[PDB]
Amino acid sequence: DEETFEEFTARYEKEFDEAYDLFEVQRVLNNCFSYDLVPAPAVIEKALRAARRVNDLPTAIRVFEALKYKVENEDQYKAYLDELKDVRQELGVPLKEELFPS
Amino acid sequence: TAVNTYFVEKEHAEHREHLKHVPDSEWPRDYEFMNIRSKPFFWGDGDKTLFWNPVVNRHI
Amino acid sequence: MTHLERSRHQQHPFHMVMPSPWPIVVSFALLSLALSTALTMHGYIGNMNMVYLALFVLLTSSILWFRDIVAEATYLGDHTMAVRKGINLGFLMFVLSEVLIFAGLFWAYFHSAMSPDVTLGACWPPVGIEAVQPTELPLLNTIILLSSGATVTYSHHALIAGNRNKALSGLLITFWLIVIFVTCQYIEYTNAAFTISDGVYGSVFYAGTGLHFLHMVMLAAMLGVNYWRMRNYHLTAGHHVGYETTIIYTHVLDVIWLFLYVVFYWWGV
Amino acid sequence: SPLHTVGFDARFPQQNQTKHCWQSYVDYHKCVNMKGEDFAPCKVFWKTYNALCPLDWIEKWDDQREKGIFAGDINSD
Amino acid sequence: DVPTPYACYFQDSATPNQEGILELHDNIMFYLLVILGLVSWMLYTIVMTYSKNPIAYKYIKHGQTIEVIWTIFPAVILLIIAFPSFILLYLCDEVISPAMTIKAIGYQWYWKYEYSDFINDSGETVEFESYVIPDELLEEGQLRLLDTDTSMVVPVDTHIRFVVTAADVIHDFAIPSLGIKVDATPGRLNQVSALIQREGVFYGACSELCGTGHANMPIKIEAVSLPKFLEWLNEQ
Amino acid sequence: ANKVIQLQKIFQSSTKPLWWRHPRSALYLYPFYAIFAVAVVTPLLYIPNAIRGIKAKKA
Amino acid sequence: GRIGESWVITEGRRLIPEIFQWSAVLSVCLGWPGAVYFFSKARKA
Amino acid sequence: LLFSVGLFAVVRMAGGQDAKTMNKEWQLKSDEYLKSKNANPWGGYSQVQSK
Amino acid sequence: VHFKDGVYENIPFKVKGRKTPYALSHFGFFAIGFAVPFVACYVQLKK
Amino acid sequence: PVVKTAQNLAEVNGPETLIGPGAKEGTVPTDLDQETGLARLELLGKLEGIDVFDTKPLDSSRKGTMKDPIIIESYDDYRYVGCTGSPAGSHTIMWLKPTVNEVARCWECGSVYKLNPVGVP
Amino acid sequence: MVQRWLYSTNAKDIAVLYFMLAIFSGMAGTAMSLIIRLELAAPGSQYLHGNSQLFNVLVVGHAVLMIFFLVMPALIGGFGNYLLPLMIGATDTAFPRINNIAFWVLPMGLVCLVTSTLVESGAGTGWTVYPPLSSIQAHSGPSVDLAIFALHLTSISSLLGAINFIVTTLNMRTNGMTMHKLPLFVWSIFITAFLLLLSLPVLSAGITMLLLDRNFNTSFFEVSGGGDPILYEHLFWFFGHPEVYILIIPGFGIISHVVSTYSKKPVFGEISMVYAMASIGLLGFLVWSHHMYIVGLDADTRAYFTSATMIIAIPTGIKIFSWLATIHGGSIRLATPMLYAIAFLFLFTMGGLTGVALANASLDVAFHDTYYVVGHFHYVLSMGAIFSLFAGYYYWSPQILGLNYNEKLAQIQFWLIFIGANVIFFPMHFLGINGMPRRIPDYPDAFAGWNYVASIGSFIATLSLFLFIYILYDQLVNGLNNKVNNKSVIYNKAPDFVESNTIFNLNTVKSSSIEFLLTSPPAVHSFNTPAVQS
Ligand code: HEA
Ligand code: HEA
Ligand SMILES: [Cu+2]
């Protein structure tokens, strides 16, 4: 309802900046997914950067699963494809190709 | 107000003193409000009522 | 020390009450009264003295609780502003329920204004139904009751202001006026207006007047209890939990009596 | 009734007719108990009490007139 | 008439008032049905869709559009379901020349109907009781627990008034088939003008407890033509 | 007065029930309820013992 | 870039099974009284 | 469900049935009288509901 | 009043004791519940 | 045993040891030392500037992070406090269960809390 | 046990007594209503050989026990005095003696009714006490007097409970809570207390008038003197209409609470919630004479009353839409309290809309005092009293006592009781819509099959209740063995689907009510420091 993405986006990155442990990472990510605002690739990249800061690969797996299934959004796929591949091959957190065939 | 209430009570509101003795032949033009069957009397002694005041009506 | 006890007894205005037998005994008294009355008015045994003693002991238990509710307010104390506000609000809601009772009594016959019905009445004023009307008969007492209430409300205001010899004079005047009122109530014991045989129009008025003759008794009982307490001088001009109750009662009873005198006396005549 | 007595009724616009019989009966009893020669003044509402009003009310009023304690408020005539 | 077994809808109509009541009933029930269908399907789809929802939309509080939509819709819905009730009350309560008037008093576990509008031989008032025939003393071919020794008669294609009252306890004049239902106050009378356009036998029992023996309250209404009504009156 | 403070001090010293005001009244009232109400409620069901059993069976 | 839906396809393929199931549930919930009516000797069968 | 129906069946068997009606002849007499009086024509004249 | 741990003290039952292994109490509760309808039916008529 | 002045709130031992002397006849006693019950503890305090049962909310604006978690004063073992965002009402009502040894966090608010009781023997 | 229980003065220690009396009374009343349905299965004296007075008396006992002695003592008092002081955070409610005298004044009503049924006199005039049928003219003996004292004592206990509720919630509410942040169940009980206070005295006065007429050889409503029972019916309905709201509103509160705590999302406009509740409470008084359209009032009066009814209906629809908004767009864990809440949202809504349909001024010509109205209120009572109480019990029992319940047993119990209630109450609308009367042990020979299906449903319902009491026993005897194994759910709110399970150890149960954040029930005078909200 006529709410700017930029303010809350910047809040998400700035909270990710001072992520001391995984608790604030978890709470901020849950709040971000709480809105209907589908996360941007930039905020997901910042979240993965915070997760790499806190060193818990399961957070990365969970957020990838959340991106794959968060909202129907008229069943858009290629957006999901790019938003996953850019952040997979930006630095490397190889996690999707193992839980699926198990 | 008190003194004029006392005056009006002693002027024409004292007529109820002789209402106890009244013939049953000049009753006011009343209606179905009375003269109907009443509760049967089982307990009590005084004129089929708790208070022995045979003054309200002359019909039993 | 001081801080810990202050926090542990500050928001706790409730005493660690002993195993008080008041609930079971009062419940037992009410149940005995109910069953005994049912057996006596229409049953197998028509004895009257035993049920009279049952009523007497129920009243003794009620008086015991009612004197405790004010003795523990001063002898035990342990009260704050919040509990005083709660007790006052409880007395206000009690008198509001009494006002609702009075309103129901009024509406029992006050809804027949323009005669909307057809038969069995529906005639205001009830022409033809002219027995000894209980209307305008006790107004000689209602006017003096209004005068007494007017002259004692401000006396009780000066009471709560000072609680001094002026308060004693006001209390004595109240005792005299309530004694006069109970005397003039009992003088019309049997033959007040009439009896109920036919034409129930003033009989409901007589019953409504009769059933309210206990609130003044309760007021007199509280006044006497406070009189005894201040003779014992336990209650100073401090936690006057009973003085406030009596002043609010006398400030609401005059209002309700005024509302009663507004209609039912000059309306329809 | 032969399916034709009044037709359209317009005496009282509102639906409820609780207070209707008294007014339609007072004039009838007054005209009947005054002259008894010609009923022309009250010849237009014959059915308002015979069939349009509860005849229990009519018989109760007749018995009350016999006993002298009328349900309504009229004079002694 | 007779309550049809295993029924799930209203009885057969007998009078225009009752069929108008039925029309108002079905008109109301249409919108009630659509409302209940809407709410039931909403419940069903919610529970069958969001039961698997992993993350809950927990920051939605305002919803102004739906707020105004379901704040303004019920008003017009209620107005459009209330207007037919008003017009039917206006039409039915119209006291359009009630041509017949009989007494109907609810006595202690029986009825004593008095017919004063008509006469029997010369000016006399016809009155008789209505006693329910006992179950043990039933005659073969009757209706159990309800059938009476003698019942009331009524002309067809006319207008009738049922003067209802009581003697000691309040009764009920419950005849759903004829579309009349007025309480029997102990002292207060009530006038209802029932006009019948259909012949037949209409049953009935008092819908008000009369103490203990209210399990057998015979109210049987039999509709006859004008010549048959004259023959019955002459016989009575 | 001259007895409020001493009474409160003694009651605080002796934290005991019965509130010290009416011990004789309590001892007088305690047996009365048991003597009276129990003996007046027992007939209520004792007398209809022979009355009870009205089967009123019909067939 | 409007990938896939076309709301109509997925919307129908999800609702139609759901609507059919809901209608069948209502049909059963109203046919059980009808089942009682049939099984009971309503017509001496 | 099977316990409920079984205990209902056994308690009804123990209680028994003592109605002098509900038999076929009563229903046929009723519908014959109804046809004589022509009541509920557009409905169900048959009221059997039991043996 | 502060001498209760708060485990089973909130119910007027007692696990300790061979007098009632939580069966006689429940049997008695069933009995008192079924008493009023059964006795009400029995006093004027058959069960 | 006898009248106690209790003019100061730091000289009263025993809540019932004070009754409050009054006057029989003359003028009304002043509402300072003539009240039965603990009511003097609040009335004299607010007469001299001491309140009872403060309703002041905690530091809502401060997030209470690791460096400076907020401090609550309660000598009891446990506590019932929480956060509603930096303003008065921001999110759904929520509160925590602080303990003497460990800490607790506010989940969605991220406001880390701490239990601070006064030293006890 | 006498030293602390029979002489109790603690709200927590007496709420459990409230519950015990509620469950015992319910089991007895369900047994007697089982009987009532059992003689209704087939025409004739299948089990009651004559004596329709016994049938009437059993009906009166059923109605009175469920109304005044079962659920009003349960959700008003038992839940109120266990949650409201607990949710506020105050150590103890003001004057627990009030609660004790309110509780202890119940049982003698039970014994006086049981002996009134025992005596040959009996009270067989319905749970409504309309004259003259309850006076010496028709019913002699002590049954009427015992019932009158029973209702008087129940009213007194209710008034005391309302007094305690009002004083606790308004005089010493905790500092953190204010007017604009007060939870929902307490608002419900507050409005309930207001309506109870404005409703009790008129009933007390009218019923005292009837008792005096029966005793003082007079008559104010009876025609014997010129009175008219229309006034008494006015007064009785003026009391009665608030009573259903009194018993139903705390159900609204608890249902809103459970759907809020289980949807993981906040309420939808709690200000709107309290607006709806307050509007309902204040508007309940506009229909004092809406229950007696059959009397013969004026057309304008009927129009005004039906307008008031249709106005009253709207806030309920607003509340239903609010619940739908709360459930929409949220994760749902399909636990048993959700099952009860959904059954409420369905069947209570359908019954209420049926009643709104009947609420037409001229529609009582078809349903009033028929089986349609019993199908009407059985629905809403069962949904908002039986199912509300079930939801509350299964929603608070694992913590208020520390004892869990078998989830499979709970599920099968819910399914059994739901199907039984549906199959019982549904046919009675078909019964009424034909026009069959009410309060008759024997009925004409038309709807035998519907009565039969009602009876088998009643047996299903009583089997469900027996399973429920067996569940109670198993919970009370096997709680520690059930907590350790996988027989029951030990965390009602599962973690959010982002959050790891190890971190979840310190996020056990966090919701919008303090009593869930407490440990195992501590000493009664807990809460040494009052809770404060920042
Ligand atoms: C709580 C309210 C309540 C409940 C539960 C019931 C339960 C039942 N009721 Fe009743 N009933 C009323 C409230 C209730 N009723 C009222 C107010 C009247 C008015 C009387 C009048 O109209 O004159 C009435 C009247 C009434 C009649 C009118 C009879 C006549 O016309 O004379 C009938 C007829 O069969 C009937 C049947 C039943 C049946 C078969 C059940 C069965 O469902 C019994 C099984 C019970 C339920 C399925 C609910 C579970 C109840 C419990 C107590 C479970 C216990 C556990 C907990 C409470 C924790 N009820
Ligand atoms: C739990 C108790 C309870 C509850 C909750 C209710 C709820 C309602 N009741 Fe009922 N009622 C009784 C108990 C109850 N009732 C009892 C005991 C009787 C007497 C039976 C006896 O005497 O034997 C009775 C009788 C009764 C009558 C007279 C019938 C009679 O003879 O019995 C009427 C009619 O005016 C009525 C109306 C309503 C209405 C309008 C509601 C509403 O509050 C329903 C609430 C639900 C909603 C209305 C849902 C919201 C609706 C919408 C979604 C909006 C849709 C419509 C619009 C556009 C506004 N009730
Ligand atoms: Cu209502």
DSSP K470-529: HHHHHHHHSHHHHHHTTSS-S-SSPPPTTS-TTGGGG-S---S-HHHHS-S---SS--SS
- What's phi and psi for I20, nearest 5 deg? -145, 105
Nearest to H49 by CA among G44, E231, I46: G44
First to last CA, chain B: 40
CB K444 within 8 A of CB K387: no
Sole residue written with tokens 């001088």: C233
Q: Is K109 in the pocket of ligand 2 (CB under 6 A)?
A: no
**Distance between CA atoms of E98 and E193, rounded to whole angstroms?**
5
> Please, what sign has the CA dihedral across residues D61, D66, D70, D72?
positive
Q: Using the beta-carbon criterion (under 8 Å), do D14 and K298 form an inter-chain contact?
A: yes
Cβ contacts of D20 on chain K, cutoff 8 Å:
none
SS3 category, E114: strand
**CATH number, domain containing residue E124:** 2.60.40.420
Residue B49: both structure tokens together: 């009522």
What is the number of domains present in chain G? 1
- For residue E155, the SS3 value is strand
Task: Tell me if chain D has a CB within 8 Å of the CB of E101.
Answer: yes
Ligand nearest to the Cα of K18, by number? 1
Annotated binding site of K for heme a3: 376
Query: Residue K98, CB half-sphere, CA atoms under 13 Å: how many?
Result: 22
Method of determination is cryo-EM
Q: In E13-154, which ranges are continuous DSSP H helix?
A: 16-49, 64-92
Please tell me which chains touch F, using 3 or more CB pairs under 8 Å as the contact test: C, I, J, K
Q: Does a structural domain hold residue K455? A: yes
* Structural domain range at position G2: 1-45
**Cβ contact K459–H5 (<8 Å):** yes
Show the tokens assigned to E230.
């004259």
What does the DSSP 8-state code read for residue K384?
I
Q: In sequence order, which ranges of chain G are alpha helices (DSSP H)?
A: 7-39
Resolution (angstroms) stands at 3.2
Separation of alpha carbons K526 and K88, rounded Å: 12
Using a CB-CB cut-off of 8 Å, the residues of chain J touching F1 are 24
Residue pointed to by tokens 């004197």: C67
Q: How far is ligand 3, taken at its centre, from the CA of residue K187, in Å?
A: 22
Q: Which residue has the tokens 């699963």?
A: A65
Angle between helices K52-64 and K107-118 (to 10 degrees): 170
State the DSSP H helix or E strand holding residue E173, giving kind and residue range, or none if neither.
strand E171-175
Q: How far out from the chain centre does Cα K234 lie?
A: 23
Is residue K302 within 6 Å of ligand 1 at its C-beta?
no
What is the chain K residue with the closest CA to D13? K299
Strand partners, E155: E224
Contact B32 D64 (CB under 8 A): yes
CA of K520 to the centre of ligand 2 (A): 41
Q: Is the dihedral of CA C188, C189, C190, C195 positive or negative?
A: positive
Q: Residue K475: CB within 6 Å of ligand 2?
A: no
- Report residue K338 as tokens: 């959700």
Cβ contacts of E2 on chain H, cutoff 8 Å: 30, 34, 39-40, 47
Please state the residue numbers annotated as binding site of K for Cu cation. 241, 290-291
Q: How far apart are CA K65 and CA K29, in angstroms?
A: 7
Q: Is the CB of K41 under 6 A from ligand 2?
A: no
Residue owning tokens 């992520």: A19
Q: Is the Cβ of A30 closer than 8 Å to some Cβ of chain J?
A: yes
The residue type found at K191 is I
d(CA K54, CA E173): 25
Residues 6+ away with beta carbon under 8 Å from J31: C238, J43
Contacts of K44 in chain H (CB under 8 A): 18-19
Residue type (1 letter), K19: F
Dist. CA C128–CA D67, nearest whole Å: 15
Ligand 1 atom 46 nearest Cα: K30
Backbone angles phi and psi of J42, in degrees to 5: -95, -40
Order of strands across the sheet with E158-166?
E126-130, E111-115, E100-106, E158-166, E193-196
Q: How do the domains of chain A map onto residue ranges?
A: 1-102
Against chain D, the chains showing at least 3 CB pairs within 8 Å are B, C, E, K
Residue K195 contacts C, CB cutoff 8 Å: no
E200-202/E111-115 β-pairing: unpaired
CA separation (Å) from K304 to E36, K288, K492?
26, 11, 47
Whether K324 maps to a domain, the answer reads yes
Domain count, chain K: 1
The answer to whether J109 is a known ligand-binding residue is: yes
**Cα K358 to Cα K376: distance, rounded to the nearest angstrom:** 9
CB within 8 Å: F5 and J16:
no
Q: Which residues of C touch F21 (CB under 8 A)?
A: 71
Residue K60, ligand 2, Cβ within 6 A: no
**Nearest CA-CA partner of K133 in E108, E162, H24, C13:** E108
Measured CA to CA in angstroms, residue H50 lies from E27, G33, H25, K130, K448 at distances of 36, 17, 11, 39, 9
Identify which of C57, C52, C22 has the alpha carbon closest to the alpha carbon of residue F29.
Answer: C57
Cβ–Cβ under 8 Å, residues K342 and E43: yes
**Any idea which ligand is nearest the CA of K387?**
1
| C155 phi-psi bin (left φ>0, alpha ψ -120 to 50, beta other) | alpha
I40 vs K24, K58, K522: nearest CB: K58
Query: How far, CA to CA in Å, does K494 sit from each of D34, J63, J105, K262, K483?
Result: 92, 26, 18, 9, 17
d(CA K243, CA K68): 10
For residues E84 and E28, the answer to whether their CB atoms sit within 8 Å is yes
Q: What share of chain D is helix, strand, coil (3-state, %, to 5)?
A: 40, 0, 60
Does K524 reside within a domain? no
d(CA G40, CA G38): 6
The answer to whether residue K412 is domain-embedded is: yes
What positions of K carry a catalytic annotation? Answer: 62, 92, 127, 157-158, 241, 243, 245, 256, 290-291, 316, 319, 438
Q: In Å, how far from its chain's centre is CA G36?
A: 20
Owning domain of residue K124: 11-516
Residue E150 belongs to domain spanning:
100-235
User: By three-state DSSP, how is residue E183 classified?
Assistant: strand
Nearest to K217 among B33, B34, B49 (CB): B49
Distance K355 CA to ligand 2 centre (A): 5
d(CA A65, CA A88): 13
Report d(CA F4, CA F19) in Å as an integer: 14
Range of the domain at D77: 1-77
Q: Is C248 helix (H, G, I), strand (E, B) or coil?
A: helix
DSSP for K414-429, please give it. HHHHHHHHHHHHHHHH
User: Are the CB atoms for B53 and C195 separated by under 8 Å?
Assistant: yes
What is the Cα–Cα distance from K77 to K103, expressed in whole angstroms?
9
Count the residues in chain I. Answer: 47
Count CB-CB contacts under 10 A for residue K90: 24
Residue E62 annotated in ligand binding = no
* CB hemisphere CA count around A99 (13 angstroms): 10
Q: Do K100 and C27 touch (CB under 8 A)?
A: no
- Give yes or no for residue K33 CB within 6 A of ligand 1: yes
Of the ligands numbered here, which is closest to the C-alpha atom of K238?
Answer: 3
SS3 call for F38: helix
Do strands E193-196 and E158-166 pair parallel, antiparallel, or not at all (unpaired)? Answer: antiparallel
Q: How far is Cα E134 from Cα E142, in angstroms, rounded to an integer?
A: 11
Q: Is A70 on the interface with E (CB under 8 A)?
A: yes
Rounded Cα–Cα distance for residues J65 and A24 (Å): 10
How far H14 CA lies from chain G's nearest CA (Å)?
22
Q: How far is F12 from chain J (nearest CA, A)?
A: 7
Helices K11-38/K448-477 angle, 10° precision: 150
Residue K423: partners with Cβ closer than 8 Å, 6 or more residues away: K453, K454, K456, K457, K460
Please tell me if the CB atom of residue K37 comes closer than 6 angstroms to any atom of ligand 1.
Answer: yes
Rounded Cα distance, C162 and J22, in Å:
12
Question: What tokens appear for H38 in the block?
Answer: 């022509």
Is K54 close to I40, i.e. CB distance below 8 A?
yes
C130 inside 8 A of chain E by CB: no
For ligand 1, atom 3: residue with the closest CA: K66
Integer Cα distance of C41 and K141 in angstroms:
9
Cβ–ligand 2 contact at K351 (below 6 Å): no
Which SS3 state, helix, strand or coil, does residue F15 take?
A: coil
Q: What is the pairing mode between strands E180-184 and E171-175?
A: antiparallel
| Ligand 1: centre distance to CA K401 (Å) | 29
Cβ of residue E74 lying under 6 Å from some atom of ligand 2: yes
Measured between CA atoms, the residue of chain D closest to residue B32 is D71
Cβ atoms K357, E82 nearer than 8 A? no
Atom of ligand 1 nearest to the CA of K421: 48
**Is there a contact between E206 and E106 (Cβ–Cβ < 8 Å)?**
yes
Identify all chain A residues contacting K502, using CB atoms and an 8 Å cutoff: none
Query: How far, in Å, CA of K89 to CA of K104, rounded?
Result: 26
Say how far apart CA C256 and CA C145 lie, in whole Å.
12
3-state secondary structure E131-150: CECCCCCCCCCCCCCCCECC
Q: Position F12: which residue type?
A: Q
Gap sites in chain G (C to N > 2.5 Å), preceding residue numbers: none
